[PDB]
Amino acid sequence: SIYQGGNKLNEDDFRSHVYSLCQLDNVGVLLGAGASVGCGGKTMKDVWKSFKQNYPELLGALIDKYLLVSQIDSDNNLVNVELLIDEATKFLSVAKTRRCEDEEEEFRKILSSLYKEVTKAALLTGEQFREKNQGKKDAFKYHKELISKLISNRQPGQSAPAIFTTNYDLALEWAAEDLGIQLFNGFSGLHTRQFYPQNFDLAFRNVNAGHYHAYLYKLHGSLTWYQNDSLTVNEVSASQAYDEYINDIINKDDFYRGQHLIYPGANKYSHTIGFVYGEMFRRFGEFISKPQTALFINGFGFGDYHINRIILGALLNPSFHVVIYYPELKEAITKVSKGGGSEAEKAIVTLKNMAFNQVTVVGGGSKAYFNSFVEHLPYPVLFPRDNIVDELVEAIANLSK
Amino acid sequence: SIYQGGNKLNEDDFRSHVYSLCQLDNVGVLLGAGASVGCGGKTMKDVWKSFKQNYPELLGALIDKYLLVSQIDSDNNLVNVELLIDEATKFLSVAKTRRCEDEEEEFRKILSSLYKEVTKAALLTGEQFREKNQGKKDAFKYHKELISKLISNRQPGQSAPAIFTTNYDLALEWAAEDLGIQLFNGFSGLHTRQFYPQNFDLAFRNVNAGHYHAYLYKLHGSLTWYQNDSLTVNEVSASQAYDEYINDIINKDDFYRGQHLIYPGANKYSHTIGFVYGEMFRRFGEFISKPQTALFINGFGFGDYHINRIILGALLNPSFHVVIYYPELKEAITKVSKGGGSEAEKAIVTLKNMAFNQVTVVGGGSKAYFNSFVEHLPYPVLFPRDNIVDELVEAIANLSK
Amino acid sequence: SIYQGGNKLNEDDFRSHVYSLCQLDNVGVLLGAGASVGCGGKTMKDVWKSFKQNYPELLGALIDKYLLVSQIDSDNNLVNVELLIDEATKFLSVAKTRRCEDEEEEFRKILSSLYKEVTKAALLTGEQFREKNQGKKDAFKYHKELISKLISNRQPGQSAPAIFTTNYDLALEWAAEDLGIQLFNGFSGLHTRQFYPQNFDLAFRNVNAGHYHAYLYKLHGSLTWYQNDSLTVNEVSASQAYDEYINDIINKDDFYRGQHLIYPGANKYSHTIGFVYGEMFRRFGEFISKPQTALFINGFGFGDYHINRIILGALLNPSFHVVIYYPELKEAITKVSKGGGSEAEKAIVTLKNMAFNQVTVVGGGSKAYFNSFVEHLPYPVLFPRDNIVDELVEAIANLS
Amino acid sequence: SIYQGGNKLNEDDFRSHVYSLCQLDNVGVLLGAGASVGCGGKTMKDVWKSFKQNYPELLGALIDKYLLVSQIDSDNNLVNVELLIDEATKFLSVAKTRRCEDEEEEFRKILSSLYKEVTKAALLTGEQFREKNQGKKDAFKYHKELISKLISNRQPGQSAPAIFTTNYDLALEWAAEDLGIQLFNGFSGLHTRQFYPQNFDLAFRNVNHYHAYLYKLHGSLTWYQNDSLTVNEVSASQAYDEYINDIINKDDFYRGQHLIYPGANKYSHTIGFVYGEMFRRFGEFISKPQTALFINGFGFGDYHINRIILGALLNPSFHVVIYYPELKEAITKVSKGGGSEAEKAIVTLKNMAFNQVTVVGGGSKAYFNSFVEHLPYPVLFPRDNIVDELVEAIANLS
Amino acid sequence: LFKLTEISAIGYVVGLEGERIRINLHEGLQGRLASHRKGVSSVTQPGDLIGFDAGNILVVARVTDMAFVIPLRQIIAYAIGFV
Numbered sequence A, B: 001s002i003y004q005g006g007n008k009l010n011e012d013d014f015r016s017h018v019y020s021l022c023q024l025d026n027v028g029v030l031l032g033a034g035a036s037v038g039c040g041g042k043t044m045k046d047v048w049k050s051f052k053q054n055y056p057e058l059l060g061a062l063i064d065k066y067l068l069v070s071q072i073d074s075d076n077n078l079v080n081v082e083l084l085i086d087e088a089t090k091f092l093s094v095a096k097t098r099r100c101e102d103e104e105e106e107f108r109k110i111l112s113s114l115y116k117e118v119t120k121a122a123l124l125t126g127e128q129f130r131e132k133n134q135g136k137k138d139a140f141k142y143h144k145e146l147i148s149k150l151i152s153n154r155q156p157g158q159s160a161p162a163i164f165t166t167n168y169d170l171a172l173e174w175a176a177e178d179l180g181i182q183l184f185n186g187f188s189g190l191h192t193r194q195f196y197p198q199n200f201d202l203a204f205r206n207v208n209a210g211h212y213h214a215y216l217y218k219l220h221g222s223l224t225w226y227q228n229d230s231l232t233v234n235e236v237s238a239s240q241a242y243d244e245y246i247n248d249i250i251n252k253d254d255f256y257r258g259q260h261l262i263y264p265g266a267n268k269y270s271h272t273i274g275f276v277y278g279e280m281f282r283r284f285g286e287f288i289s290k291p292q293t294a295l296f297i298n299g300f301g302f303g304d305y306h307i308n309r310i311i312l313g314a315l316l317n318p319s320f321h322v323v324i325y326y327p328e329l330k331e332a333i334t335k336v337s338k339g340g341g342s343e344a345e346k347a348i349v350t351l352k353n354m355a356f357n358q359v360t361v362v363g364g365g366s367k368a369y370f371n372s373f374v375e376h377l378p379y380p381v382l383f384p385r386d387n388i389v390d391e392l393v394e395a396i397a398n399l400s401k
Numbered sequence C: 001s002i003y004q005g006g007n008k009l010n011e012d013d014f015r016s017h018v019y020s021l022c023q024l025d026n027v028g029v030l031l032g033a034g035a036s037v038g039c040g041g042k043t044m045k046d047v048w049k050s051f052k053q054n055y056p057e058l059l060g061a062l063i064d065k066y067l068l069v070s071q072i073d074s075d076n077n078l079v080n081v082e083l084l085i086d087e088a089t090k091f092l093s094v095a096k097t098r099r100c101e102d103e104e105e106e107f108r109k110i111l112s113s114l115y116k117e118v119t120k121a122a123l124l125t126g127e128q129f130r131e132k133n134q135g136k137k138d139a140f141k142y143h144k145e146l147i148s149k150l151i152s153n154r155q156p157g158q159s160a161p162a163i164f165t166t167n168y169d170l171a172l173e174w175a176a177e178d179l180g181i182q183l184f185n186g187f188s189g190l191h192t193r194q195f196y197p198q199n200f201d202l203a204f205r206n207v208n209a210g211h212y213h214a215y216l217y218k219l220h221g222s223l224t225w226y227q228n229d230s231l232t233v234n235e236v237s238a239s240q241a242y243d244e245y246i247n248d249i250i251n252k253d254d255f256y257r258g259q260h261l262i263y264p265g266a267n268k269y270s271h272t273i274g275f276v277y278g279e280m281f282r283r284f285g286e287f288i289s290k291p292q293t294a295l296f297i298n299g300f301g302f303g304d305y306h307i308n309r310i311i312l313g314a315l316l317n318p319s320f321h322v323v324i325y326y327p328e329l330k331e332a333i334t335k336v337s338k339g340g341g342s343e344a345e346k347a348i349v350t351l352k353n354m355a356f357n358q359v360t361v362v363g364g365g366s367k368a369y370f371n372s373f374v375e376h377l378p379y380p381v382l383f384p385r386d387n388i389v390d391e392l393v394e395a396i397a398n399l400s
Numbered sequence D: 001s002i003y004q005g006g007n008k009l010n011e012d013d014f015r016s017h018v019y020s021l022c023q024l025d026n027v028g029v030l031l032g033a034g035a036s037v038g039c040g041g042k043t044m045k046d047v048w049k050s051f052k053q054n055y056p057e058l059l060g061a062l063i064d065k066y067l068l069v070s071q072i073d074s075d076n077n078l079v080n081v082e083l084l085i086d087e088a089t090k091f092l093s094v095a096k097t098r099r100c101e102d103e104e105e106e107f108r109k110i111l112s113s114l115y116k117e118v119t120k121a122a123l124l125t126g127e128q129f130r131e132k133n134q135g136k137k138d139a140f141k142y143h144k145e146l147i148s149k150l151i152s153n154r155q156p157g158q159s160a161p162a163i164f165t166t167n168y169d170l171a172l173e174w175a176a177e178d179l180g181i182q183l184f185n186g187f188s189g190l191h192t193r194q195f196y197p198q199n200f201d202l203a204f205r206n207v208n209h210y211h212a213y214l215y216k217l218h219g220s221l222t223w224y225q226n227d228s229l230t231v232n233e234v235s236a237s238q239a240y241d242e243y244i245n246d247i248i249n250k251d252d253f254y255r256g257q258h259l260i261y262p263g264a265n266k267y268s269h270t271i272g273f274v275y276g277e278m279f280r281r282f283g284e285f286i287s288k289p290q291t292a293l294f295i296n297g298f299g300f301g302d303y304h305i306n307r308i309i310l311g312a313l314l315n316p317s318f319h320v321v322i323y324y325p326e327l328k329e330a331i332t333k334v335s336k337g338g339g340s341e342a343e344k345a346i347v348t349l350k351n352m353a354f355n356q357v358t359v360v361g362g363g364s365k366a367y368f369n370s371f372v373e374h375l376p377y378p379v380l381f382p383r384d385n386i387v388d389e390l391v392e393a394i395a396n397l398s
Numbered sequence E: 001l002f003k004l005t006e007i008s009a010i011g012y013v014v015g016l017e018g019e020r021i022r023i024n025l026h027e028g029l030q031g032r033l034a035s036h037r038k039g040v041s042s043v044t045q046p047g048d049l050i051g052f053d054a055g056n057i058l059v060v061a062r063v064t065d066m067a068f069v070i071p072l073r074q075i076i077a078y079a080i081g082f083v
């Protein structure tokens, strides 16, 4: 259902708490991989199946010799991937260091497969990834409503809205190019496009006396970004990328040697050369720790230490509000009372059980999804009625009926 | 039964009084030993039964040979402990001077066993005192609600809360190390912790253009404090203590020395070496002497002569309000009408029979306990709905019927 | 031997530069392992010597079979000891799952030997490690001067000082606890003390009547940090650590627990333990990339690639200034100009030769040490260089 | 014979230091028993030097049987008379409790004979103690000037003076009722006068230089406890009639939990509460910035007041001035392995690199009536008696 | 416990225009005088010298004026060097 302060509240008060919440001077959203299922995307549960359905032999070694997975988990499809990768990357260093040439070649294929199945699930359109005007179809519609609503609810003087995302897909840009709105992502240029971190401090303005713009922060990168040195990162278009490297990976049986820039692991600090991750999380921190702040969270399954460890430390400021959508809120209050349960549901039942009115939690199956989320945000009122006569006139009329 | 100004008052007015009391500049809470019964604590009437059950041979000498306690008072368990601990030292001090070496032993044997029983009554969890994470259990939730509410209902600009107590136990620390709130108690350091009385004048601040906190005053000491007589007071955690100077006190059956500093007697000034005792009562008064001040009292039996003189002298100021909880009030009202009654009943009914509307007493038995005192406190409203617009249209609902 | 941009300087042009540099917005310090030799510590090669004296049997299974070290470096005493324990932990973790019992004992037995040798060298007081008031002893006399001089010269509306360090010992804490200063290190609590990274952004403030506090970043860890359950990291006191684990380490033999210790950069593959190491470098860069910044270095050998990368990248910003102390310029210039020396020498030399008025290097053997770095820093005016306190405390204690 | 900072001074450079000291924010004064020998009083030697003479048959029990005093001290006349009374008061309660009928009547005599030498000496007059208008006489002439100068040397906005003493006599109240000055002392009321410990936080003001503060650390003759549990103040005429004309001219001591001088019944939780609140205020006035304290009449034979003063020089804004008229002998005696704790204590700080301290000696040059004359009158202060020639012309109109 | 200064304060700056410095005072202070380990000093009259602590040096100034804004006092001073 809907909980606040550890207690229960009703629909007609949530519908107005939202309204009163979208009038503050700092508003943001954080999306995950579920928000992209209505457009062609996939979840991590739908990747293990596609791995064990097209690479059946390697799986045998993973279960028999190296002893990394259990048959029960594979059969029941309850196996993680962002933790398997970090172990397949550990069994490899201590083999390259002790010079065993029969395991390097057996561990260099598994990672390529896990990186190919993670890539085929972020295109959203298959072969039509390189064409143009893909933000005109009937799928990228609520992604347009979201931006329109976020931007039309700002009075002058206030700051622009922010968006935070993990997934690599391009569903937020396709829907803003079709709409006439310029997002900011850090880079600048066309013939050589390059990251300068002081581009997050710019802002439009007009000659005499447009105002429609927003900021986009991707925390785990994209599949249009590449690296060539230790001081530069470049971006190309989609047709260009699909010709250069994204086609070989999909079709040829090569080993992934660092063509594109993604962090799908569990410990993302082992990457001792990445300097974008830090500049993104620094801005996330700087934003979450200022007064009169509101945040919406959707699509996130609560399996990231680094983010569950930031959301807790911001609830010690008495001007910060969150709203959280989680369908399976009942099957997690069930399991965690009788001892069992993973950390994912522990983390969110901990939040459900609190005594501060600055936390709200929504459940209820298919009414906590993205399409329902959007329809709970309000359109503004252009000409605000003082409405004294509006209600006065009907107040008198009642009795004569 | 609730009496304001000697008159009679009802619940739906009491509850609106509390709301407006909790919106003043200075607010405070004084607690006692009854606030720690829902967690594993005992009382002074039970300490006596335990000392009666064990050690039955000293009680003989105590009644017959020394004329120091009466048979009736013993049986009926009405005896005071602080006025016996304050005579078993006089009887000693006289013998230390007359040089009666045998008389100089019984009283040591008696004081050791009297100090050993009030020590194992502040170990709320008996043998799990040394373990970690004791504030996660179920017996400590009404201690978290208190702090949460007191901190929540504060505005930007208004000072922070203070908490006064007389107990020795660690509940209000176990129940804050969980939330992640930081209490100030006057000490500093980790490897060598020392008491400086200027840490009561500090606050927090974010270093831009975790600021929750509160102040705690223990008036009678603690189990984690000790003195080397170099005129320095050292604080320690709850495992070092158990390992070094508590297991002995309990089991080793030794004599007593000033291992840790507690003031359980009746005249706290006899201790001509205590200087930390005097920096707490110098703040109690400095607090209650301010304007726009409210105090809530719970758990206190009104048997302290030096405490029940300051509250009387603070009631000649028109901006100080006090609320008191006393379960067994009818019996006192009758016992003083019959010309009898003890010195605490004579005080509580004299506070009840006033003619000022700044005193409020709350009886009713189980309706005056610590778990109800907390539900009486309010949660705040963050977006104040004036609903003056709503009045117009919700007024007409009654018309239809 | 003092060089600025290749050209030489004199002491009076140098002391008039340090003062101009210490008046800037942001100030910082980066220390090393040599700074702790005037107190009872040791150096990384004096560690390897003692290792290969007492344990020469395990020194063959480490160069022949597993390829973990090289003979040239083992002979010239040029081994990294904080980079080998991590690899050995990786090996052991792999063997546990692969279930090869013939290989877990041979790694337990050679980790118990490395920890026993790195721990013993960081107590600084031996068996007087679990006692109290270890900052009064005279060995810790300049660590106090450093702190006091860094604080006593700041003005209202100016950020407080930060102190980064690679050591894993308790000297600065023992000193501040005796001066009466507060250091923030990311922890909070006494009965359960936990890591909160959001409180490197806090500060103090007085109500009516304050600015005595500083920030400390430790890049490799400490002996007082450990892990009990999956999700949390705890801190304790010296007297408590000594009784829990630090004693068996020394006395008992064949004692090794597992992924329980957080020193030095060892169990870096978990996700609850590397989160602690990464924040420090994060904050290091975020500090070293501000405007109007100055950095002093002392005790660092320049055997790390990432820190040198960070510094060289930072030097693009025209408002960053540095100062370095390396007492082997002469013994390295030739060894590198004839045929080549070692990466450390090459790196440290590349900086001497540039057209920069915002770099500086210092040599002279015993003239570029810690007891002399602490003396080039200006001393305030009102700060009292007299002690009529002890003569009164003596009489107060004599009263009887 | 005037030592500042370890070295010497002269009269003028010190009389110019005094004037600058009296102009600080907080000013105070601490007096002793040697300040009331110019009015009819007696020091603490002369009291034992007479108890010894008048009651020898009791001087043996205290030494050979109960061990309450030592022989060399009694022979050199160096005993503390307050702690003896406290201990003898605490020896009687045990016996009264456990029903010993010999040790109960053996101590009544001791206490009756001890409470009879200190009372007779605290009456500064004699049978004129019960009468009215006693501060009009000649003995109380410098006590007036002290207060006049302490009040008239302040400015508007500056606080009022404080006064601490160890006597239990009525020499500063008689001498203020005459000037027309009001002293706060904690008590309020007339028909039932009671102790309220917050009246020290009050002050006057007009609606169209009136008051000061007094702290008595050892009690007074007019304080007592009734069959109730509360302390009550009364006037001298009423006290003479209740409980002072029997002490001397009879042999009566059966109210053993009744009197509040000279620091006796501190084992009752109701009588110690009034003693504590005075030291708790001394140790809080003596810890403020810009404070000055003048001492006079006090022999440094108390451990706690010394342990309280010594610990206040650690703030650089507290200054002290001391009068000790037997400083030469003490230096002599402690030069060569000797001396008592008081002499050692004073000599300890006589040698210091502290400009906050200043010591004065010279016998009759360090007495009360010279302390006073070292204090200044303002230049616009009325002194000539120009109103007294006119109050008798109104009497001649009989 | 840190002894950053062996000296009490007298006020705090609130204004800076050209080369004339404006100072406000504390509350209890009336009678021209302040105290310290060596003795007593006058601080309020025109023609007197005053000092400001500025990091690692000491700025010296001379008093010119004295006025009201228990009301609020105010002072004006001019710098003449540093130690």
Ligand SMILES: Nc1ncnc2c1ncn2[C@@H]1O[C@H](COP(=O)(O)OP(=O)(O)OC[C@H]2O[C@H](O)[C@H](O)[C@@H]2O)[C@@H](O)[C@H]1O
Pocket (backbone or CB within 6 Å): A032, A033, A034, A035, A037, A038, A043, A044, A045, A082, A166, A298, A299, A300, A301, A302, A303, A304, A305, A326, A327, A328, A368, A369, A370, A371
């Ligand atoms: N139509 C829908 N609308 C909204 N939510 C949905 C929908 N369908 C399913 N869900 C919810 O989507 C949730 C499953 O989302 P997950 O597979 O965890 O996406 P991830 O991106 O977290 O996974 C990778 C993480 O790993 C790294 O650590 C990063 O932190 C990443 O977050 C379920 O709760 C569904 O109820």
Ligand SMILES: Nc1ncnc2c1ncn2[C@@H]1O[C@H](COP(=O)(O)OP(=O)(O)OC[C@H]2O[C@H](O)[C@H](O)[C@@H]2O)[C@@H](O)[C@H]1O
Pocket (backbone or CB within 6 Å): B032, B033, B034, B035, B037, B038, B043, B044, B045, B166, B167, B220, B299, B300, B301, B302, B303, B304, B327, B328, B368, B369, B370, B371
């Ligand atoms: N569950 C409960 N909730 C609230 N109150 C309770 C509960 N159970 C009992 N009570 C009340 O708790 C009260 C307990 O009264 P006593 O134990 O005699 O008083 P003290 O604990 O302050 O005595 C110790 C102090 O007394 C000296 O002054 C020293 O300062 C000592 O520190 C009763 O009124 C019960 O009705």
Ligand SMILES: Nc1ncnc2c1ncn2[C@@H]1O[C@H](COP(=O)(O)OP(=O)(O)OC[C@H]2O[C@H](O)[C@H](O)[C@@H]2O)[C@@H](O)[C@H]1O
Pocket (backbone or CB within 6 Å): C032, C033, C034, C035, C037, C038, C043, C044, C045, C080, C082, C166, C298, C299, C300, C301, C302, C303, C304, C305, C326, C327, C368, C369, C370, C371
């Ligand atoms: N008294 C002294 N004062 C100043 N410097 C001294 C003194 N004594 C010796 N030195 C200098 O101190 C230096 C000792 O260098 P080392 O202790 O091996 O290096 P580290 O402690 O940084 O090793 C840790 C790093 O190793 C890995 O790369 C990790 O990345 C770590 O960052 C010599 O140059 C001496 O000239």
Ligand SMILES: Nc1ncnc2c1ncn2[C@@H]1O[C@H](COP(=O)(O)OP(=O)(O)OC[C@H]2O[C@H](O)[C@H](O)[C@@H]2O)[C@@H](O)[C@H]1O
Pocket (backbone or CB within 6 Å): D032, D033, D034, D035, D037, D038, D043, D044, D045, D080, D081, D082, D166, D296, D297, D298, D299, D300, D301, D302, D324, D325, D326, D366, D367, D368, D369
């Ligand atoms: N005319 C005079 N003017 C000034 N001073 C004088 C005069 N005559 C003597 N003196 C000095 O007055 C002093 C007399 O010292 P004493 O009366 O024994 O000591 P106390 O009055 O503090 O006794 C009360 C204490 O007794 C308990 O122990 C408590 O601790 C109390 O504090 C000598 O030094 C003389 O030089």
